[PDB]
Amino acid sequence: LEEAPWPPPEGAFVGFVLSRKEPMWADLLALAAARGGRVHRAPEPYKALRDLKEARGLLAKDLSVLALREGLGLPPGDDPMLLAYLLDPSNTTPEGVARRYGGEWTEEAGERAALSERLFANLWGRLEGEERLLWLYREVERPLSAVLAHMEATGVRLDVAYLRALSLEVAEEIARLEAEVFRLAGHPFNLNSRDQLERVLFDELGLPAIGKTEKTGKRSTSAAVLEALREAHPIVEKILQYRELTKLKSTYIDPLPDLIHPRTGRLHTRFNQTATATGRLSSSDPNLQNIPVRTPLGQRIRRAFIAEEGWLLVALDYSQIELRVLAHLSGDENLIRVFQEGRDIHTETASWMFGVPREAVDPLMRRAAKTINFGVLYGMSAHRLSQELAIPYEEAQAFIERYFQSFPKVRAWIEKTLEEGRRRGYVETLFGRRRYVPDLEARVKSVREAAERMAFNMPVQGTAADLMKLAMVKLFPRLEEMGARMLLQVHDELVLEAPKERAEAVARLAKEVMEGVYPLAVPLEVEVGIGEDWLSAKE
DNA sequence: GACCACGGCGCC
DNA sequence: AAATGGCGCCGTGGTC
Ligand SMILES: NCCCC#Cc1cn([C@H]2C[C@H](O)[C@@H](COP(=O)(O)OP(=O)(O)OP(=O)(O)O)O2)c2ncnc(N)c12
Ligand SMILES: [Cl-]
Ligand SMILES: [Cl-]
Ligand SMILES: [Mg+2]
Ligand SMILES: [Mg+2]
Ligand SMILES: [Mg+2]
């Protein structure tokens, strides 16, 4: 392309180079734009940002987040990544998308700008005739990228002092556990090494191996294996406790306080829009979609996520979302009726599991039942089921047959979904998001059946994903108008931050928006809480 | 220092 | 571990 002076004309596509992948932490090393057979390179990248009306191009959101960081209201616009991702969600990297749709991802801003231009042209062409994918792009993905940009640049507050103090307490308990483990082994070793631990458990001590690892076929020391060996030796329980503590300390307690941004004094994640096979977002650097909540220490960590002074967190979470979605997709009357009657399948399963009345079910019991309900739905084997419930095989098997015989059209929907996936090569969500699953026609049964579970899960998980995205796009402008902030999405959950005076009003509005987003054959219900911290807000 | 595969495990 | 699905990050062991 012909080189020309900065600035570019309106509608130009941008290319840019960051010192590191995370836009909140990156230095903008270079910036360029391309349009009409010209490439414009900015002599001073930061100042040049002011000349752009929007960020249009590959990884648009990243540039937008950096702009917002610098106090510039630069929204993201067209991004070829989003087009490619809709065409085929295995399109997750600019490297792959460039190669596939007409160019090469290099380290020069001008070349990236030019690449962005031609990829958009090509990919736009590929979306012609694809009306449903076009709808998702214009009505969901493109607007959502703006929403996510604001969320990333906003961040969430963390009680750093609290976490620092907690680290010290946890360190001392870890020391007690490791000392016991070493005593019981008869000698010290690296307890963080599963290879060393395998030899201690299975070679040095008497313990029977139960399972093997996938890639290298070592004797597994996974939590599943250790639970089964709980009554074989006292060292086992000590290791399980050591694992829990060290996992939480190494992954959350210690790293996160070090990631507070110096300017904002908050913790900023990345919400990746082209990262999953089903249409879910992912979160990284750090991942804020896997903050602990199940165990006592886990809850203590989640409590570190707090509202700004004078504000409150609002947490909203769709009730039994994929089950409701399944009712709609399958059209099973029986299942639809369950939700019309305001029943809770997780609580009911839980009451069965632990053999207690529905009122006796505590949250942790209900949570346990989720794994069982979704596990069975998406193809769990009777054997594992019996195993994880520690009930005889016959009972487990019996539960799965009743599970489905209760809901006739569910199996029918699955069969229909797979048959259609085999013919077309892909399956799709309610709104037409696609996932290609070529292994539906695999001649190896284990490979084929794995593919089948991936395939019939996607429309359900993906539709739920679509619904949340649509809800975020609708909700965002309403929140802006109320002076509230959207902070995090955790798949079927949103966490907002509102001024105390308005927190109650915001919760009600957000609840109604989420419930009314796209009516199905069954009501959508959203549970909402308000609190000074994430844990409090969910209770 | 950075990458990697692996086993493992946090969440949804 | 096992015929649930979807993610990202940890330390280890290893290479470069
Ligand atoms: N906090 C949940 C911890 C255990 C779990 C879970 C799982 C959650 N999902 C998927 C299905 C669910 O609708 C969705 C939302 O997660 P969710 O909100 O935990 O589950 P839910 O909304 O059904 O129940 P609730 O009324 O409490 O919101 O994530 C799953 N899909 C496949 N296998 C699994 N084990 C799970
Ligand atoms: Cl950093
Ligand atoms: Cl839960
Ligand atoms: Mg939910
Ligand atoms: Mg949830
Ligand atoms: Mg892995």
Distance A223 CA to B7 C1' (A): 11
Which nucleotide shows the minimum CA-to-C1' distance to residue A226?
C1
Q: Which two three-digit tokens encode residue A262?
A: 């110096």
One-letter amino acid of A437: V
The CA-based dihedral angle spanning residues A118, A120, A125, A127, taken in that order and rounded to the nearest 10 degrees:
160
Q: Are residues A167 and A103 in the same domain?
A: no
Q: Are residues A59 and A131 in the same domain?
A: yes
3-state secondary structure of A18: strand
Q: Are residues A207 and A286 in the same domain?
A: no
Which letter does DSSP use for residue A439 in this model?
Answer: G
Chain C positions with a protein C-beta closer than 7 Å: 1-13
By C-alpha to C1' distance, C1 is nearest to: A211
Q: Which two three-digit tokens encode residue A362?
A: 């505590």
Distances (CA, A) of A206 to A178, A201, A212, A235, A459: 20, 7, 17, 12, 47
Residue numbers of the domain that contains A100: 1-153
Q: Are residues A177 and A140 in the same domain?
A: no
Entry field: residues in chain A: 539
Q: Are residues A429 and A488 in the same domain?
A: no
Distances (CA, A) of A513 to A191, A314, A467: 49, 14, 11
Relative to the alpha carbon of A257, which ligand is closest?
2
Best CA proximity match to A389, nearest among A421, A438, A352: A352
Say how far apart CA A324 and CA A318 lie, in whole Å. 10
Q: Are residues A230 and A158 in the same domain?
A: yes
Which resolution in angstroms does this entry have?
2.0
Q: Answer yes or no: are the C-beta atoms of A496 and A504 closer than 8 Å.
A: no
Residue A264, domain CATH: 1.20.1060.10
One-letter amino acid of A482: M
Residue A300 CA to ligand 1 centre (angstroms): 21
What was the structure determination method? X-ray
Best CA proximity match to A466, nearest among A494, A431, A493, A495: A431
For chain A, counts of helices (H) and of strands (E): 22, 14
Say how far apart CA A318 and CA A524 lie, in whole Å. 7
Report the Cα A339 to chain-centroid distance in Å: 26
β-sheet bridge partners, residue A199: none
Distance A193 CA to C13 C1' (A): 9
3-state SS track over A41-102: ECCCHHHHHHHCCCECCCCHHHHHHHHHHCCCCCCECCCHHHHHHHHCCCCCCHHHHHHHHC
Residue A25 CA to ligand 2 centre (angstroms): 7
Say how far apart CA A201 and CA A521 lie, in whole Å. 53
Distances (CA, A) of A524 to A336, A460, A470, A478: 11, 14, 14, 20
Report the Cα A162 to chain-centroid distance in Å: 26
Where is A499: in which H helix or E strand? strand A493-499
Q: Answer yes or no: are the C-beta atoms of A65 and A149 closer than 8 Å.
A: yes
Work out the burial of residue A208: count CB atoms within 10 Å of its CB; fewer than 13 is exposed, 13-18 middle, 19 or more buried: exposed
What is the bridge-based pairing of β-strands A157-158 and A305-306?
A: antiparallel
Say how far apart CA A368 and CA A267 lie, in whole Å. 30
Q: Answer yes or no: are the C-beta atoms of A83 and A273 closer than 8 Å.
A: no
Distance A217 CA to C1 C1' (A): 11
Report the Cα A537 to chain-centroid distance in Å: 20
β-sheet bridge partners, residue A17: A30
Residue A51 CA to ligand 6 centre (angstroms): 43
Q: Of all protein residues, whose CA lies closest to atom 33 belonging to ligand 1?
A: A374
Say how far apart CA A399 and CA A203 lie, in whole Å. 38
Q: Answer yes or no: are the C-beta atoms of A161 and A265 closer than 8 Å.
A: no
Residue A503, domain CATH: 3.30.70.370
Say how far apart CA A67 and CA A60 lie, in whole Å. 11
Domain boundary among A153, A185, A201: A153
Q: Are residues A32 and A140 in the same domain?
A: yes
User: DSSP per residue over A344-384, as a string?
Assistant: -HHHHHHHHHHT--GGG--HHHHHHHHHHHHHHHTT--HHH
Q: Answer yes or no: are the C-beta atoms of A253 and A167 closer than 8 Å.
A: yes
Say how far apart CA A38 and CA A62 lie, in whole Å. 23
Q: Name the region of A418 (left: φ>0; alpha: ψ -120 to 50; beta: rest).
A: alpha
Q: Which residue out of A317, A318, A370, A457 has the highest number of ligand 1 atoms within 8 Å of its CB and is therefore the one to mutate?
A: A370
Q: Of all protein residues, whose CA lies closest to atom 35 belonging to ligand 1?
A: A371
3-state SS track over A215-267: CCCCECCCHHHHHHCCCCCHHHHHHHHHHHHHHHHHHHHCCHHHHCCCCCCCE
Say how far apart CA A539 and CA A537 lie, in whole Å. 6
Best CA proximity match to A466, nearest among A435, A425, A501, A496: A435
CB-proximal residues (5 Å) to ion ligand 4:
A 317-318, 321, 492
Cα atoms in the Cβ-side hemisphere of radius 13 Å centred on A361: 22
Say how far apart CA A181 and CA A70 lie, in whole Å. 51
Please, which residues have CB within 8 angstroms of residue A482's CB and are 6 or more apart in sequence?
A498, A502, A505, A506, A509
Q: Which two three-digit tokens encode residue A449?
A: 């059946």
Q: Are residues A336 and A443 in the same domain?
A: yes
Where is A315: in which H helix or E strand? strand A311-318
Residue position matching structure tokens 């009516």: A519
Angle at A100 between CA A99 and CA A105, to 5 degrees: 25
Q: Are residues A358 and A282 in the same domain?
A: no
Peptide bond into A286 cis (omega under 30): yes
Show residues, CB within 7 A, near nucleic chain B: A 194, 198, 213-218, 220-224, 226, 243-244, 247-248, 251, 287, 289-295, 298, 367, 371, 490-493
Residue A21, domain CATH: 3.30.420.10
Residue A166 CA to ligand 1 centre (angstroms): 29
Q: Answer yes or no: are the C-beta atoms of A389 and A396 closer than 8 Å.
A: yes
Distances (CA, A) of A439 to A279, A419, A422: 19, 13, 9
Domain boundary among A464, A484, A505: A464
Chain breaks in chain A following residues, C–N > 2.5 Å: none
Q: Which two three-digit tokens encode residue A260?
A: 């507070």
Residue A321 CA to ligand 4 centre (angstroms): 6
What's the structural domain count of chain A?
A: 4
Q: Are residues A140 and A31 in the same domain?
A: yes
| Ligand 1 site, CB within 6 A | A 317-323, 346, 367, 370-371, 374-375, 378, 491-492
Q: Are residues A94 and A138 in the same domain?
A: yes
Q: Which two three-digit tokens encode residue A369?
A: 């039942």
Q: Which two three-digit tokens encode residue A339?
A: 């939700």
Domain boundary among A153, A174, A209: A153
Q: Are residues A457 and A367 in the same domain?
A: yes
β-sheet bridge partners, residue A283: A271
Distance A182 CA to C13 C1' (A): 22
